[PDB]
Amino acid sequence: ALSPRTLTAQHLNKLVSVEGIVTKTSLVRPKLIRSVHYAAKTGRFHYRDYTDATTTLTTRIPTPAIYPTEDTEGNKLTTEYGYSTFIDHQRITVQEMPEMAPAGQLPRSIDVILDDDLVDKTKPGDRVNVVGVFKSLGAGGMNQSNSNTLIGFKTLILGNTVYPLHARAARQMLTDFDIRNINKLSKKKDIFDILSQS
Amino acid sequence: LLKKIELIFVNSLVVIYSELEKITLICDKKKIKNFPLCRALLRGQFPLLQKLTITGVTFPMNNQDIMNFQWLLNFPDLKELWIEDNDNCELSKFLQLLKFSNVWKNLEKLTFRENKLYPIVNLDEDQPVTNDDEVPSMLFYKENLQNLEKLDLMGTSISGSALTRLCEQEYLDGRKLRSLNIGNCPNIQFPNNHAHTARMILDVNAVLKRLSKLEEINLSHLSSLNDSTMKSFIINVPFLENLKRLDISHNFEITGISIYEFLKKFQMDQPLAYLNIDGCSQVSHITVNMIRAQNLVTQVDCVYERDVWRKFGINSYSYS
Numbered sequence A: 001a002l003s004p005r006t007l008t009a010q011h012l013n014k015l016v017s018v019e020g021i022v023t024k025t026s027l028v029r030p031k032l033i034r035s036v037h038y039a040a041k042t043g044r045f046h047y048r049d050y051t052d053a054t055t056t057l058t059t060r061i062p063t064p065a066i067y068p069t070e071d072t073e074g075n076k077l078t079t080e081y082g083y084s085t086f087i088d089h090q091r092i093t094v095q096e097m098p099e100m101a102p103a104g105q106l107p108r109s110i111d112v113i114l115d116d117d118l119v120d121k122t123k124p125g126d127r128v129n130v131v132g133v134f135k136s137l138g139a140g141g142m143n144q145s146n147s148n149t150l151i152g153f154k155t156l157i158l159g160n161t162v163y164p165l166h167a168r169a170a171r172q173m174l175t176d177f178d179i180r181n182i183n184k185l186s187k188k189k190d191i192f193d194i195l196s197q198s
Numbered sequence B: 001l002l003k004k005i006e007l008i009f010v011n012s013l014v015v016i017y018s019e020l021e022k023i024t025l026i027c028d029k030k031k032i033k034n035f036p037l038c039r040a041l042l043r044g045q046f047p048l049l050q051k052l053t054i055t056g057v058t059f060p061m062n063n064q065d066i067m068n069f070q071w072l073l074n075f076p077d078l079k080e081l082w083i084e085d086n087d088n089c090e091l092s093k094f095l096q097l098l099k100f101s102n103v104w105k106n107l108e109k110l111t112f113r114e115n116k117l118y119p120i121v122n123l124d125e126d127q128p129v130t131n132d133d134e135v136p137s138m139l140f141y142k143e144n145l146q147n148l149e150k151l152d153l154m155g156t157s158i159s160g161s162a163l164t165r166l167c168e169q170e171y172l173d174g175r176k177l178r179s180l181n182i183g184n185c186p187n188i189q190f191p192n193n194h195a196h197t198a199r200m201i202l203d204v205n206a207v208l209k210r211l212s213k214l215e216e217i218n219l220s221h222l223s224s225l226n227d228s229t230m231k232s233f234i235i236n237v238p239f240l241e242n243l244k245r246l247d248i249s250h251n252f253e254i255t256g257i258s259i260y261e262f263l264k265k266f267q268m269d270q271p272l273a274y275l276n277i278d279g280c281s282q283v284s285h286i287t288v289n290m291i292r293a294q295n296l297v298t299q300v301d302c303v304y305e306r307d308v309w310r311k312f313g314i315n316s317y318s319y320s
Helices: A176-186 A191-197 B038-043 B091-099 B141-145 B160-168 B204-210 B227-235 B256-266 B285-293
Strands: A015-023 A029-039 A045-049 A077-095 A109-115 A127-137 A154-164 B004-009 B022-027 B051-055 B080-084 B109-113 B150-152 B179-181 B216-218 B245-247 B272-276 B297-301
Touching: A015 A109, A015 A154, A045 A077, A109 A127, A176 A191, B091 B141, B160 B204, B204 B227, B227 B256, B256 B272, B256 B285, B285 B297
Parallel strands: A109 A154, B004 B022, B022 B051, B051 B080, B080 B109, B109 B150, B150 B179, B179 B216, B216 B245, B245 B272, B272 B297
Antiparallel strands: A015 A077, A015 A127, A029 A045, A029 A077, A077 A109, A127 A154
16 A cells, blocks of 8 residues: 555555545547458458557567458458457556655656546546556667666556545445434534534 | 379469379469369269369359369269368358268268358258158268268368267267367357357367367367367366377467466376467467476477468468
8 A cells, every 4th residue: 555655666566556646637548459350352350459568467469559451361351340349548647645745845646547447437636546556668768779778667557446535435425324313413403503613 | 104193283374084093283273263174073083083182273153063062973982082272162062962972982081171251051960851751861971971080171161060960970980080170160169158159169078079089189270269168178188088289379369378277187198299389379488388398298389470370281282
């Protein structure tokens, strides 16, 4: 159980929970995960799976997001949307709570990836707890086109659940005991004075 | 005096033959747009012809006698038939021939491979009666296929139930069958799959009970063989004790999990002799290195970069 400050390189590839405030939510985009193609002469439906470092918890070989256009025999393919499969994808920045940041330091932040039904579960300014796998991705400048010796690797949380918060939950649950107490108090003749004095 | 003739018609430009023993006709399907020996094969007889191998030709549309394999009745004693990428042929018409004549006293091996996906063929077990006062037509599937050692149906759109019916009817003999190739057949689904039409199901338990002594299985390009479906093979390990050579290559689904637990339960039988998983993008390199290291297979091939399977001469006589 961490925050965007105390989340540390020792935590990479572990399952972590981070508390913070959401900022800079990306647009929602469909991410291609499988495409299906009718080979016009052959009659078979070919298909192709896709992978990147966000779609999987393990570093499977990447797939270049290219659509097929020809069969092995050279027969022209046609892409079949509606049988092809896309997940919704969203990237959000969770910022450290300013109340927690130590003396004279500004809040740290980290980027979370959310997929399918987790998308749009938060808007900016939401205080949140995110659970997910903290990961690294990309080449980190090890690819020799990058001369810079010092830059680090990009890192993310691949999200598994998102809880909104106002603990000191954003929407409080009410027991029937709460319902009955709330109604009981409402019948006290001077309840407006009681609540406003409270 | 010619006993064995081969023709490899690389390009195009514009009666009794007792001597012959083997005819191999191979064509560039792109350049050749007809069927060279069509008149000769339908008109003549080649009564001592042991092996016939026709690939890449294009059957004429104007001749249902060709398309129904009516000529193919001409050749008794035909120890082996190989027929591959014959673009306008169909396994349906072939099985209709096999229904209605005892065409061959003996086939040791059959190999049929149509290229394009024709509609679903189910085993046509309908035995009609002209009248119930008259005989039902004797169906010659048994005595035609009773002899087979090698059955190969790669790419042929045979439905899974058709193959189970071939085994339940005991048309395929089992006691003599040794090598089965059903790769690239999109109409095969295994029992654990929830998504199907029931007559595409293969009942591997029934099949492997029937034909238990077989050596060599080929399921390459059988995308339907996901990891869940491999569980059916795991529990049916006791019925395939003769199996030495297993090709499941170019399966883009099969994770190393199924591979490993299959070889581990097989080890409860002594390694499997040989296994092919070339092009299988999902088998983890460390798993296959474990397979080598713990010696669960005497040889295993993992050329991930090998794009294609049709080694000419060895696996296929389709030209180039």
